[PDB]
Design a protein around this motif. Structure first.
Motif, short mmCIF file in Angstrom:
data_model
loop_
_atom_site.label_atom_id
_atom_site.label_comp_id
_atom_site.label_asym_id
_atom_site.label_seq_id
_atom_site.Cartn_x
_atom_site.Cartn_y
_atom_site.Cartn_z
N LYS A 181 0.73 -1.13 0.35
CA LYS A 181 0.04 0.32 -0.22
C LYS A 181 0.43 1.54 -0.11
N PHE A 182 0.27 2.30 -0.36
CA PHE A 182 1.29 3.67 -0.15
C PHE A 182 -0.13 5.06 0.10
N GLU A 183 -0.06 5.68 0.68
CA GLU A 183 0.05 7.16 1.06
C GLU A 183 -1.02 7.47 -0.28
N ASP A 184 -1.89 8.25 0.14
CA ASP A 184 -2.93 9.33 -0.71
C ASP A 184 -1.52 10.23 -1.20
N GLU A 185 -1.42 10.88 -2.21
CA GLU A 185 -0.44 11.44 -2.11
C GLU A 185 -0.79 13.12 -1.88
N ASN A 186 -2.15 13.17 -2.94
CA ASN A 186 -2.91 14.67 -2.79
C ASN A 186 -4.07 14.42 -3.68
N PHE A 187 -5.65 15.45 -3.39
CA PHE A 187 -6.12 15.41 -4.01
C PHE A 187 -6.43 16.74 -4.87
N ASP A 188 -5.53 17.31 -5.61
CA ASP A 188 -5.68 18.19 -5.96
C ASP A 188 -6.06 18.46 -7.42
N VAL A 189 -6.44 16.93 -8.01
CA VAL A 189 -7.38 17.03 -9.02
C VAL A 189 -8.40 16.20 -9.15
N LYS A 190 -9.86 16.56 -9.28
CA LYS A 190 -11.50 16.52 -9.19
C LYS A 190 -11.57 15.25 -10.10
N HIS A 191 -12.86 14.91 -9.65
CA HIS A 191 -13.28 13.97 -10.72
C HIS A 191 -14.06 15.22 -11.19
N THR A 192 -14.36 15.43 -12.20
CA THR A 192 -15.11 16.06 -12.51
C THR A 192 -15.79 16.33 -14.39
N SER A 246 -7.93 7.02 -12.09
CA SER A 246 -8.39 7.80 -10.24
C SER A 246 -7.89 5.75 -9.75
N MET A 247 -7.16 6.32 -8.84
CA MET A 247 -6.52 5.40 -7.69
C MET A 247 -8.03 4.01 -6.79
N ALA A 248 -8.30 2.79 -6.82
CA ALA A 248 -8.68 2.60 -6.44
C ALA A 248 -9.01 2.04 -4.56
N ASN A 249 -9.39 2.28 -3.39
CA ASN A 249 -8.85 2.19 -2.12
C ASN A 249 -10.08 1.44 -2.07
N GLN A 250 -9.89 0.94 0.29
CA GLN A 250 -10.43 0.30 0.31
C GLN A 250 -10.58 1.59 1.44
N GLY A 251 -10.17 2.89 1.38
CA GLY A 251 -10.04 3.30 2.69
C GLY A 251 -8.76 4.29 2.65
N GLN A 252 -7.97 5.50 4.06
CA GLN A 252 -7.10 5.98 3.40
C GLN A 252 -5.95 5.35 3.81
N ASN A 253 -5.14 5.67 2.62
CA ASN A 253 -3.70 5.37 2.18
C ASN A 253 -3.53 4.03 2.30
N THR A 254 -4.13 3.77 1.31
CA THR A 254 -4.05 2.30 1.35
C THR A 254 -4.44 2.00 -0.68
N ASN A 255 -4.05 2.76 -1.11
CA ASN A 255 -3.44 3.05 -2.47
C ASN A 255 -2.54 1.41 -3.22
N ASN A 256 -2.97 0.86 -4.40
CA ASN A 256 -2.17 -0.52 -4.97
C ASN A 256 -1.54 -0.20 -6.19
N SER A 257 -2.35 -1.36 -6.86
CA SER A 257 -2.21 -1.05 -8.41
C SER A 257 -4.08 -0.89 -8.82
N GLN A 258 -4.84 -0.82 -7.88
CA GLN A 258 -5.78 -0.77 -8.06
C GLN A 258 -6.63 0.24 -8.40
N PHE A 259 -7.67 0.80 -10.24
CA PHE A 259 -7.79 2.18 -10.32
C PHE A 259 -8.93 2.17 -11.19
N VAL A 260 -9.37 3.03 -11.65
CA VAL A 260 -10.54 3.12 -12.13
C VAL A 260 -9.66 4.46 -13.59
N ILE A 261 -10.67 3.62 -14.39
CA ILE A 261 -10.78 4.95 -15.58
C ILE A 261 -12.97 5.76 -15.16
#
Ligand SMILES: [Cl-]
Length: 167
Positions: free
Chosen positions: A85-96, A102-117
């Motif tokens: 896992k790795f940290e949520d880097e920032n939220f500077d870009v929104k889902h507009t 966008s990184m998929a996760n199961q809670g704060q700072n749980t990024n891995n390789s899963q992503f969405v388009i």
């Protein structure tokens, strides 16, 4: 924001033997360098693991195409170049809108390789999921992926990243 210095990567996608075409993505290294670098390295496979032969395991029309489970291939796994896992880097870009990565996760700072388009704007994901790139070409391929999804996310064909890399 968008910039010539940002890395560009691609997926060639297939649905049960049917070629869907190439998705080309620009990664916001200038905004979220660690998150962009993770995704870039997973595209090239240079660490010895990556997105090649992984699937889009969950596709919800009008919402997301989700993939990147490179350890279990069913939505329960994933791994980053930094560890499990790795940290949520920032939220500077929104889902507009559509076409955002966008990184998929199961809670704060749980990024891995899963992503969405993304397939639509998704304000509810803001400050929750880190946006790190966008589709610069091949949105038509993304809409083909969407066509095989369903309201609960199951897909009627296996959708695979047959090749991927850095441009
Ligand atoms: Cl410049």
């Amino acid at each position: 924001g968008p910039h010539m210095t940002n890395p560009v990567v691609f997926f060639d996608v297939c649905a049960d033997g049917e070629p869907l075409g190439r998705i080309t993505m620009e990664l916001f290294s200038n905004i979220v360098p660690r998150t962009a670098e993770n995704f870039r390295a997973l595209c090239t496979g240079e660490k010895g693991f990556g997105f090649k032969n992984s699937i889009f395991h969950r596709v919800i029309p009008d919402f997301v195409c989700q993939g990147g489970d490179i350890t279990k291939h069913d939505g329960t796994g994933g791994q980053s170049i930094y560890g499990d896992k790795f940290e949520d880097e920032n939220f500077d870009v929104k889902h507009t809108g559509p076409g955002l990565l966008s990184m998929a996760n199961q809670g704060q700072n749980t990024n891995n390789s899963q992503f969405v388009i993304t397939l639509k704007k998704a304000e509810h994901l803001d400050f929750k999921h880190v946006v790190f790139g966008f589709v610069k070409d091949g949105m038509d391929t993304v809409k083909k992926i969407e066509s095989f999804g369903s309201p609960k996310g199951s897909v009627c064909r296996r959708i695979t990243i047959t090749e991927c890399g850095q441009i």
